[PDB]
Design a protein around this ligand. Structure first.
Ligand code: HEM
Ligand code: HEM
Ligand code: NA
Ligand code: NA
Lengths: 713, 713
């Protein structure tokens, strides 16, 4: 059946802004997962998971009689899709059970692991999400095998359809680098926002780069991809050595034995995939990755035998039964148990990527230190496993249940607790008037509050106006934030704050985070007043001001809005058209297409553009909240042409006279070109729409202001 | 960006069930189009449309100084996508302004017609939908040119994204028959549900079949496509001759001059397309279809000149300036005006498809009669234009405004008005108890009410339980409805009805249509009671019984559910897999994926399957309303395999012993296979979900019982 995507494959795709609607959700509109989780008997779920670890099912017999290894890998791949660049991927939505992740080659036989969990998911129902359960099961695996975890937070609500993520452009699973859709260019530079070396892998190729079994080269890919998943060298070594203390790989016969991945398998497979014709197709005969490595002499118990083996032997390049490159310990005795036959034993083996931990010079120091101090290894692995499995959950306010660790970690972008009375509605009105009386403009007020609140991304729930991080490095120096203007606005607001706070009793005070948002609300109010409307913009206090020492500058860097269509901003030239980057930012902001549309049209006429650019400012009453963007954009009396100097800027001229009326970017003009966006523009550009436009703009403004307010959830 | 659709292009697409969500809608949740339309000053809109007809814009100058032809074609293409097979297409949702239809080749330069209407749409705003406006404009064009229309109804609400319609499988616009994705096989057999001869055409090729200019062969395509749009010979002849009384075609130079269609054009084109490098690109130089035909001596006035020209000359094959086949009158004088130059005149011309009206024997007789009796032509065209433009609007209760014709027409599937007091809640309770005391089973009651209500399709709003059409030909004879069993149930219900109606006073009576639905409700109550739940099923009286004479047997044929997954029914073997046909039926029923899921699971255990087939009846307490379907389907203790005898039936065996536990179809097993459906099945198959299942089932049951109840809108 030929589709619009087939006819016009480069047209902008708005369906990404309309996923996760109430139509696709089987739970009531009123369902609150946090409330269901809060009543879960978490102890009883853990006792069940513990029993399951050693209760082998004959359809997928447990290696060594213990599923622990399998379930650790399951949870690490659930979490391991995360990219710091956009915050997409990770464990937080349980997307491993949907396409395409459920069928990535790196996720082979994780369908079996998930199916093993059905009885427990069925028993506890809506009270534990598949997303929380994947992670919990990993924790319980570790605990069952003698490793004490750092803690666990529930709260990851289930989703009900595939997330829209750019995972790369390749058309062939696992394609080696350098093809027509290469994710690499230059000196092995991985394109943002990717965080894996090949389509369908979690991070790196366990044989080595593009299959070349060079541990030193593999180390470079490990470091690059893990950094792109927000992990540093110490965390990376801890995670890899920690994980590969347990279990085994599977490659007992040729890969050509393995049938279709789950999304391609026949209906009778009932959601399972990779059915194998090799011998029994399971257990002793299992084929998953193609590698056949078992790392320790006790694969079902925590130990320090991974680093003892790594450093205590020299290693030889060999091949698994499926032909994969892997390494075996030279001259070793048969000390590694067999997963099914008590009478056989094997020499220690390793992946190329495991050898990277010894042969990269910077990893070798860390590995040596962990080998000498197994307690340091254990502590680092515990902390890294928590970060890995929680890095996409957002603020600590979202963390549920009795196992939440009390320690506040830098990567959580922590916000201090509020310890004073909050401002009330009269206070808010007084503050808005003082803000407006200072001389700050509508344009300044809206721009500042937009800049502060629009760092939020729903992908990992990082960013937003909470914390007043706009006043700190690095946000205060981002070009999009206009650092000099920003500093002068912040200084005026801080004088207002000081004056207000010094007049109070009873310890009532207002944070700068709250005042930034409130001041933006006053700007929008005044803009509405300038257009003849009396409205109150809602405002909820309770944000707090975070310190520079609570703000990791390097991890903040990924929030810099190098494209922000809502401010008509592009930091450089990108191979993705600007309208696609608009819709990308809108999705991160959790906006629908109507919300995106109203919001952009308003922000243009309020003066929010970076550098005071006139592009898209289609009004003669700047700083009044009107629908002039849409009415002027849609006027057929104007003809548009790309400029000679820059094909991405357009001149709008009177058709009759040739007089220059406006200029606009691709971001501006897409609203009068794309057939779905133009239909939305037409609603807000009709003669009956000025009141609707004001009310919808206020609503969407308030939504943006509150994106990170999980304290009010 | 590689997508799930790229990796698994044959996987079932559920996003069609979650289209048109509140996310993509710019209007409030509470927006009611009918109430906005009821306040429109329709007379004022029509005055404005009159003024527009001769207000030529320089960017697309009006032929003969009047746009009426162009706007009649616009309206007739809006309506002309309609297929009686599925009810999809037509004018009723305004889809001509969205992809793909805004860019079909047959819709070339209709982007100009639509843009000419923007100022009016803008002036009246939400009070007139684009959908209503396109049709009203057609009407105004006719009336402006001297033709009295039969009427007009408003009420077509605008939609906000593209409708999911199978338009064919070809990958090339306008592909001639016999390609790798041919919509034709056999003796020129068009595949259902298609109603056009080439991808991107409204009905037929104006040059003749696959471009071959044989008017007799063209006539066969005309009859077949128009029948597939619910029009007979008399209506077809009237419409074609009626339309081609006005205006002209456009083919002033080679088609190679014409640029990208709208969805392909550059952003500066602002939603327009087909920009032409031929001379001025417009007006006298316009290129649309490539044909250059002007049919009458007064193209901007109603006349009888079409049939006078058709019959008064003999015709010679020639070519337009773009090289298209067309016809010119032998020996004729230059009598046809030029659209721009008062000093030129042209010989009469015709399309191949116009000549069909003379050279096909059956059309010839009709055309002669219209020629001889012009008042009959006028009246038949007025009626057929009304049908064309309202055929997809549904019941008369949806028709809004002061121009709605009082005459009731057969194709509106009319329902008599209620002229007595309705039953109340006490009466309902009495009737339900009587239904249960008669001996009729859960299975019979649910199957009957399902059969009656599930004829509804939202595409054209035909079908549903209103009218008690299930007791009439042809529904009472459909194999899916089980004629024998149906007759025995209807006879029992009719005795109950007679007894109840005979006891009443004051003219109160219950229709059979109501009693069928009420009896279904009682069956669901009983089924719930069998499972140990106390449930009252909502019911709304007010349906009436239609007569056989109000029920066109031929037009009812298209509602026959040749695939109905909700009863595990397939009438024959089809090239489309049965799970695709399930989701298709759900979409017609307006169901989301969670609704479809709960509904099917319930219907299986209540005994709704055609022929009492055991396929999918995964319970040992048939006729009790439980979630057994889901709990047993998801049981990993069962292994499924296709049977040797039939690859579309599956056996589910105990994995440990090999004992057969169940059988199922592809419709049954898709819920355990498709990753998104199985996530839904899991919610209803959980230990906490028996009450949720029962309540969600009742809600969806009631929804289906009320689909056609536009009398209570
Ligand atoms: C350079 C990074 C990594 C690479 C290339 C890698 C590669 C692999 C491969 C290829 C397998 C075999 C799959 C099979 O055939 O069954 C596997 C197994 C495993 N990995 Fe990793 N791994 C990496 C990091 C991690 C991390 C970070 C963890 C967890 C903290 C982890 C935990 C495990 C576990 C537990 C298994 C055993 C599965 C079982 O017993 O069934 N790995 N790894
Ligand atoms: C077999 C059926 C039909 C064929 C193949 C057909 C074909 C066409 C073609 C090829 C054009 C020229 C498009 C262009 O170059 O501008 C056209 C024009 C038009 N058709 Fe049809 N037509 C059909 C039926 C209809 C019907 C049912 C109506 C309306 C009741 C209609 C009304 C018109 C009008 C008014 C125009 C003139 C447009 C103008 O002046 O710009 N036609 N037709
Ligand atoms: Na994420
Ligand atoms: Na339709």
């Amino acid at each position: 059946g030929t589709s619009n995507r087939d006819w016009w494959p480069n047209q902008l795709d708005l369906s990404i802004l309309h996923r996760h609607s109430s139509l696709s959700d089987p739970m009531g509109k009123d369902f609150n997962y946090a409330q269901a989780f809060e009543k879960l008997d978490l102890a009883a779920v853990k006792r069940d998971l513990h029993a399951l670890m050693t209760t082998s099912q004959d359809w997928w017999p447990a290696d060594f009689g213990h599923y622990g290894g399998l379930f650790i890998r399951m949870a690490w791949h659930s979490a391991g899709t995360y990219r710091t660049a956009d915050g997409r991927g990770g464990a937080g939505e349980g997307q491993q059970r949907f396409a395409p992740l459920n069928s990535w080659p790196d996720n082979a036989n994780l369908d079996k692991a998930r199916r093993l969990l059905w009885p427990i998911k069925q028993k506890y129902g809506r009270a534990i999400s598949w997303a929380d359960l994947l992670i919990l099961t990993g924790n319980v695996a570790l605990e069952s095998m003698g490793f004490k975890t750092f803690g666990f937070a529930g709260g990851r609500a289930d989703t009900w359809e595939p997330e829209d993520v750019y995972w790369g452009s390749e058309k062939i699973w696992l394609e080696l680098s350098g093809g027509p859709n290469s994710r690499y260019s230059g000196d092995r530079q991985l394109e943002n926002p990717l965080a894996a070396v090949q389509m369908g892998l979690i991070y790196v190729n366990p044989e080595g780069p593009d299959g070349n079994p060079d541990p030193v080269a593999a180390a470079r890919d490990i470091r690059d991809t893990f950094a792109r998943m927000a992990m540093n060298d110490e965390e990376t070594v801890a995670l890899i050595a920690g994980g590969h203390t347990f279990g085994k790989t599977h490659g007992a016969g040729p890969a050509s034995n393995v049938g279709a991945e789950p999304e391609a398998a026949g209906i009778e497979a009932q959601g399972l995939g990779w059915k194998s014709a090799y011998r029994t197709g399971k257990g002793a005969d299992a084929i998953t990755s193609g590698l056949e490595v078992t790392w320790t002499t006790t694969p079902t118990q925590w130990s320090h035998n991974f680093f003892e083996n790594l450093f205590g032997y020299e290693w030889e390049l060999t091949k698994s039964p499926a032909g994969a490159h892997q390494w075996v310990a030279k001259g070793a005795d048969a000390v590694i148990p067999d997963a099914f036959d008590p009478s056989k034993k094997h020499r220690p083996t390793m992946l190329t990527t495991d050898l990277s931990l010894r042969f990269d010079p910077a990893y070798e120091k860390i590995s040596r230190r962990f080998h000498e101090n197994p307690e340091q290894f254990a502590d680092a692995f515990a902390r890294a496993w928590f970060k890995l499995t929680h890095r996409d959950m957002g603020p600590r306010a979202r963390y549920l249940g009795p196992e939440v660790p009390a320690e506040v970690l830098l990567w959580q972008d922590p916000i201090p607790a509020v310890d004073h009375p909050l401002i009330d509605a009269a206070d808010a009105a007084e503050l808005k008037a003082k803000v407006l009386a200072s001389g700050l403009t509508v344009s300044q007020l809206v721009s500042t509050a937009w800049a502060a609140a629009s760092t939020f991304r729903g992908s990992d729930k990082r960013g937003g106006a909470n914390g007043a991080r706009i006043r700190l490095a690095p946000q205060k120096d981002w070009e999009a934030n206009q650092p000099e203007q920003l500093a002068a606005v912040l200084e005026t607001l801080e004088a207002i704050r000081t004056a207000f706070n010094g007049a109070q009793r009873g310890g009532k005070q207002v944070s700068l985070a709250d005042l930034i948002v409130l001041a933006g609300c006053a700007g929008v109010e005044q803009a509405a007043k300038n257009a003849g409307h009396a409205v109150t913009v809602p405002f909820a206090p309770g944000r707090a001001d975070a310190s520079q020492e609570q703000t990791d500058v390097e991890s903040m860097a990924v929030l810099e809005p190098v494209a922000d269509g809502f401010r008509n901003y592009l930091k450089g030239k990108y191979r993705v058209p600007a309208e696609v980057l608009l819709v990308d930012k809108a999705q991160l902001l959790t906006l629908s297409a109507p919300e995106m549309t109203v919001l952009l049209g308003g922000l243009r006429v309020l003066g929010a553009n970076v550098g005071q650019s006139r592009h898209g400012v289609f009004t003669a009453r700047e700083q009044a909240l009107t629908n002039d963007f849409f009415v002027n954009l849609l006027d057929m009396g104007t003809e548009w042409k790309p400029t000679a100097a820059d094909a991405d800027v357009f001149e709008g001229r009177d058709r009759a006279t040739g007089e220059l009326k406006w200029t606009g970017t691709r971001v501006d003009l897409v609203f009068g070109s794309h057939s779905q966006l133009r239909a939305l523009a037409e609603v807000y550009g009709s003669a009956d729409a000025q009141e609707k436009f004001v009310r919808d703009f206020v609503a969407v403004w308030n939504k943006v202001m509150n994106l990170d307010r999980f304290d009010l959830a």
